[PDB]
């Protein structure tokens, strides 16, 4: 039931908030990992939950201060919530997310880059939000850099998905 899921969410968010207050990043990971799983299972309910949104805003605001395993799990949560969901883009804009995603795309970790590309490619709305902050040229340059930096990897198909959405956006803006 939805009531059970809501209770499941409250438990996971309580653990994450406790881990953050204690500066225990291992416990942050242990908390975000089942939240990413729950988000895959019930993305409608997780994305709408106000405690999840408050938690995501705090994690996004401090994104680069977290170690890489936490950063991956933050993006893993957002990737599950943005899948087939352009309406999650407005919350991400309000949370200041897109400059953080832009720096993540230039991170040397392929797993982080793949998750960032999964979010970016999730909808035309996501590409529009990214371009509103970084420009057509900024995104084009990212994709060209990533194609050369990460061959024969999950990134290639995600880079192409972004490039196809970008072409649609470019035509509309003309």
Query: 100 with 64, same domain?
Result: no
Same domain, 92 and 170: yes
- Report residue 45 CA to chain centroid gap: 17
Q: How many domains does the chain have?
A: 2
**Domain co-membership, 17 together with 79:** yes
Solved by what technique? X-ray
| Residue 114 DSSP label | H
**How far is 126 from 149, CA to CA, in rounded Å?**
23
63, 71, 70: which is closest to 100 by C-alpha? 63
Cβ atoms within 10 A of the Cβ of 41, count? 12
Structure's resolution in angstroms: 1.8
Cα gap 75→32, rounded to integer Å: 10
Domain hosting 146: range is 88-174
Residue 159 structure tokens: 């880079």
59 and 78 together in one domain = yes
Let me know whether 123 and 62 are in one domain: no
Instruction: Examine the domain organization and report whether 20 and 92 are in the same domain.
Output: no
Dihedrals φ, ψ of 87, to 5°? -70, -15
């Amino acid at each position: 039931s939805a009531a059970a899921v809501e209770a499941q969410i409250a438990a996971l968010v309580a653990a994450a908030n406790a881990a953050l207050a204690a500066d225990d990043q291992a416990a942050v990971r242990a908390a975000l990992a089942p939240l990413a799983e729950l988000a895959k299972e019930h993305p409608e309910l997780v994305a709408a939950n106000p405690e999840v949104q408050a938690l995501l805003k705090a994690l996004i605001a401090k994104f680069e201060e977290f170690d890489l395993e936490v950063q991956r799990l933050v993006l893993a949560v957002v990737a599950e919530l943005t899948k087939d969901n352009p309406e999650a883009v407005a919350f991400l804009k309000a949370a200041g997310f897109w400059p953080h995603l832009a720096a993540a795309l230039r991170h040397p970790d392929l797993e982080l880059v793949r998750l960032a590309l999964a979010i970016l490619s999730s909808s035309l709305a996501a590409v529009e939000a990214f371009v509103a902050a970084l420009g057509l040229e900024g995104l084009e340059a990212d994709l060209a850099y990533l194609r050369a930096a990460f061959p024969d990897s999950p990134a290639a198909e995600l880079i192409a998905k972004v490039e196809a959405l970008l072409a649609e956006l470019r035509a509309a803006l003309e």
